[PDB]
Design a protein around this ligand. Structure first.
Ligand SMILES: O=P(O)(O)OC[C@H]1O[C@@](CO)(OP(=O)(O)O)[C@@H](O)[C@@H]1O
Ligand SMILES: O=P(O)(O)OC[C@H]1O[C@@](CO)(OP(=O)(O)O)[C@@H](O)[C@@H]1O
Ligand SMILES: O=P(O)(O)OC[C@H]1O[C@@](CO)(OP(=O)(O)O)[C@@H](O)[C@@H]1O
Ligand SMILES: O=P(O)(O)OC[C@H]1O[C@@](CO)(OP(=O)(O)O)[C@@H](O)[C@@H]1O
Ligand SMILES: O=P(O)(O)OC[C@H]1O[C@@](CO)(OP(=O)(O)O)[C@@H](O)[C@@H]1O
Ligand SMILES: O=P(O)(O)OC[C@H]1O[C@@](CO)(OP(=O)(O)O)[C@@H](O)[C@@H]1O
Lengths: 313, 313, 313, 313
């Protein structure tokens, strides 16, 4: 009866028409969604019989065959992947094909994170085309393989969420223009690293548990899988932090394919994403595998931690 | 593990690149497949609770939103449907959204038949753009909702069959360049109309049952649903006939959306399609709802009936 | 989301609770449903992925694990299968695992036919337990892998249709206490064998194409798969006929697991099943793989052919 | 296509056949599987389509139709439900239909918790039949709607995991006689309530973040859904803790259908379930909706917190 179904394709296509463009993005996101549906199906009967290597080979293949990319950066590949000339296009794509895959056995939410840049140079494609600021992303998002499979997409016009209807094998648009809440009730961080944190994070944790103005204390959640913690942060409001510890002095989370996508999504939904020292999106990278500290969330909460970072400075 | 999956999109896109074109066909067939997956899902839980009217509204919508059509001809609509200017493209499409839908209750194979022309005039779109010879089709085919859902596609380069993988919601290419057999063993026709047939059909039926050279007699099958009878004829070889009776002097089957698609498919697979008087594809139409007699099948069998039509002439 | 789902299990249990007899039967049919779902899925992705052998082995394994059978007859195995003493129960199941399996490649409907007897002896299970007349059948029916999957189940109360809801893997009751039309307008027979047809048949078909009482001729329909044509005959009406010719001298369809299951379905829905001479249900079997002619369908139609048999003898 | 599928039904039946007891139990759990599949599907398309109310009604309808229950306790209904005399059997089922349902919107895992007692009386069913200590549980477990759907079922032999194969709608055995790690490296507790935590807890958490025996600190993990964290704790190891604070004075988790099902799973897999004072399984219930603290998980970890409880009393 739902004859007017807004699929992701119908959505992405109607928009690149306003860009007065060539169609490569619609083709790209199209291919990407073939990878996303196949990984979901795989995670759903994963047990009835690694997985993140299949995953990876599926995203690289659907992206080369789309004739819309030229440099592909993977979590799994040492170097950047340059698309053969016959299959080349203008977009650069950095992705993590199955984020949080250590946790596939404990059956909790995992996902694919991706960030798409445009190559702007006249030269032959290289990893340098990929070493751009995250503020330069044309589009970015993640797919979520939880109780339902969700693709959240951020572009210049906003943040939209599409859900996989498993009956038809199509992502359907279920929420338009997701704006995050100004202030939330949840803080998300691995507190098992408490001795390794700096003075400003420890002070912020302390007042969420023991509120200064004799208020109501913050709830705590940490799924242990970045996509699940950030999607909850977007839809429910709150703060999410994976700051620098001593196992990880530059942070644990990679910049081109975990911090920049999720930060692009957050800021487009009206939140902030910072390292405590600077905006994540404005960090200029040097190595495609470099890590970054990240504190992303509802504006008033991230701002709070930013001020605890200044007194301590 | 199947990282290199040839989907219909990957197939259609790689080909329009050789046409040095604009992308409207890939978009069109893409939209069409959203309609096809949704109708399949519907026929699969059709009972757990008309259907061909939903079907129709689903194909018209996915085709308008593709920005690749301008005139749409339906079995269900009196007139041709002209696409609003903002959503217009170059292709004309004639379809039957759910062929053989009287038979949905008896649970047998049904399907969607479509034929795509190109508008070649400079004028504003009209039904006249649709009144072309079937020899002028750029592409044509059918989707089959039987035990599996099959989309058979014919274009200038050949006949290819793609199957719906229901796990991923993607049509996969399972047979490349289907050529029909020279001569087959099966004849397909509704013999309950036997008193109404002409002398040449009656003579051809007679020698399939009672072979002149003391041979082995032809088997007989007639599902009663054009898509199922023609797909069997393509994949197994044989003859299929719905010739003029007295309930139907111009035949029962419509020309722009049942006879021309199936004839385009047949001739591209190397078979023949005739009315007994002329090639179906070369019939120039006058009304978008006009019917035609059709005898389509393996070459040596159709040719046989063509000669029984000449002695009788 | 229906909170009041009526599955095949809840159904059968609500008929057997008012009996104090078998919850052993619920176990058997329940097990038969797992195999039917596992075959349906395999047929639905068949081309993307011997089918009847793996189906044979699935129906035997799921049956032996019900703890409800002791003897099993299959189309594929020459001798009966006496189930292990440890896994025994009181029922004999006779099954054709994948009817019309030559018709799989052409995507025409296929199905699973099963008759279930009760072992009416104290002795050790032997194929003589399988050798009851169909009259002695406790439950019988079929599964049709069509545009939708349907399990039709005839027991002593009547016939009930169930449909596979692919979303949850359950057979849902969609038609209760089914009864066939007294008279239909379709006849189903392979007229390629017209030459070796006996004269009762030959006369009867001319009364269909050329009505004596000048009425409309019957429509012909022959899918070529027993389950598709016996199921169309049960819902629409009309006659289905596979009589004896010489190439198949005492008929083609096997008596224990194709003619008798269909004949018990037909008679518990008020239609008739004969061989032209006697009732199928009273023929006392001598080989497990013994054949028989079969004419079934609407009571006023079987009757009209039985009186042309009375005339030639 | 596996011909030797081991479903939950074939499993349970192969353990109960070597017992001469219940095939009444197979009926119950079988019915519980229909509801679990019907809820899984609803959660998987949730956003595209009160969920816990329709889930409540589904678990009650499918349960009353098993002819295996007489008393039912639900999170949603204040009084027990004494099943009709016509539909009775010997088992009491206590169930939480949709655990952590506030977490549905954020797409984090949710689940169904069920404990099953046997009515140990001759009398008329009354909620006093529901009021056994968990020690008296015959079968207990949960369903996790995660990246995959899993039914974990603990009976007297041990714990077994089953996974929903979405293709055929059956739960397939994927792990046999499960046993938890003696000691894990993760602790799970909501530290937003750190202020009102009692001192055994507060000390124990500092031994996790700051190890006395200078070892690596434990990793924190808290999904916020009981089934996700009790299931991660069973497969990985570690401790899960919901102790009493004042806002929820005698603990938050309801004893009859959340603490006791989880506690019987944990103990039949060799882990421990306590309240800090006593074992959960021996607490004699007084209200059906009575609450309790719960600390569960690896034996060497519960032990380490039980000795800090011995210290403060
Ligand atoms: O159609 P092409 O040329 O590929 O480019 C479309 C451009 O418009 C944008 C706007 O954010 O996406 P979209 O296709 O959705 O409109 C860019 O991301 C993209 O580069
Ligand atoms: O164990 P910790 O250090 O908390 O790491 C969890 C974080 O690491 C990531 C990185 O991929 O998962 P993981 O290491 O388990 O693979 C993120 O998804 C997640 O936010
Ligand atoms: O890309 P556009 O401009 O839409 O046209 C492609 C042309 O090539 C053909 C060749 O048959 O299809 P295809 O896209 O598969 O290559 C025509 O049917 C079609 O008109
Ligand atoms: O009953 P007859 O005259 O044989 O008609 C069957 C033919 O008509 C069609 C036309 O749509 O089906 P139907 O009339 O049953 O809807 C074809 O699919 C099929 O080949
Ligand atoms: O080709 P004919 O002789 O008409 O056979 C049709 C009958 O044979 C069967 C026998 O099982 O099919 P098939 O040979 O194609 O396997 C039945 O399903 C069907 O009703
Ligand atoms: O917010 P807190 O108090 O940590 O609650 C978590 C616990 O509460 C429950 C209660 O059912 O979730 P919830 O309130 O979100 O419904 C459990 O599933 C979960 O373990």
């Amino acid at each position: 009866f739902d004859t007017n179904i807004v699929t992701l394709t119908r959505f992405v296509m109607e928009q690149g028409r306003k860009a007065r463009g060539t169609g490569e993005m619609t083709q790209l996101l199209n291919s990407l969604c073939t990878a996303v549906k196949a990984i979901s199906t795989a995670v759903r009967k994963a047990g009835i019989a690694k997985l993140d290597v299949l995953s990876n080979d599926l995203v690289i293949n659907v992206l080369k065959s789309s004739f819309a990319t030229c440099v592909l950066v993977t979590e799994e590949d040492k170097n950047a992947i340059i698309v053969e000339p016959e299959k080349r296009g203008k977009y650069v794509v950095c992705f993590d094909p199955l984020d949080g895959s250590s946790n596939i056995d404990c059956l909790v939410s995992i996902g694919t994170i991706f960030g798409i840049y445009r190559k702007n140079s006249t030269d032959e494609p290289s990893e340098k085309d990929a070493l751009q600021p995250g503020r330069n992303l044309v589009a970015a998002g993640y797919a979520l393989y939880g109780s339902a499979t969700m693709l959240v997409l951020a572009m210049v016009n906003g943040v939209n969420c599409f859900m996989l209807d498993p009956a038809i094998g199509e992502f359907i648009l279920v929420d338009r223009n997701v704006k995050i809440k100004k202030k939330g009730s949840i803080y998300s961080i691995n507190e098992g690293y408490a001795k390794e944190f700096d003075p400003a994070i420890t002070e912020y944790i302390q007042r969420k548990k023991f509120p200064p103005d004799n208020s109501a204390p913050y709830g705590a959640r940490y799924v242990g899988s970045m996509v699940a913690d950030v999607h909850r942060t977007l839809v429910y409001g709150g703060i999410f932090m994976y700051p620098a510890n001593k196992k990880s002095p530059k942070g644990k989370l990679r910049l081109l394919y975990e911090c920049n996508p999720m930060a692009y999504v957050m800021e487009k939904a009206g939140g902030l994403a910072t390292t405590g020292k600077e905006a994540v999106l404005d960090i200029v990278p040097t190595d495609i595998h470099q890590r970054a500290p990240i504190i992303l969330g509802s504006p008033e909460d991230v701002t709070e931690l930013l001020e605890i970072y200044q007194k301590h400075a």
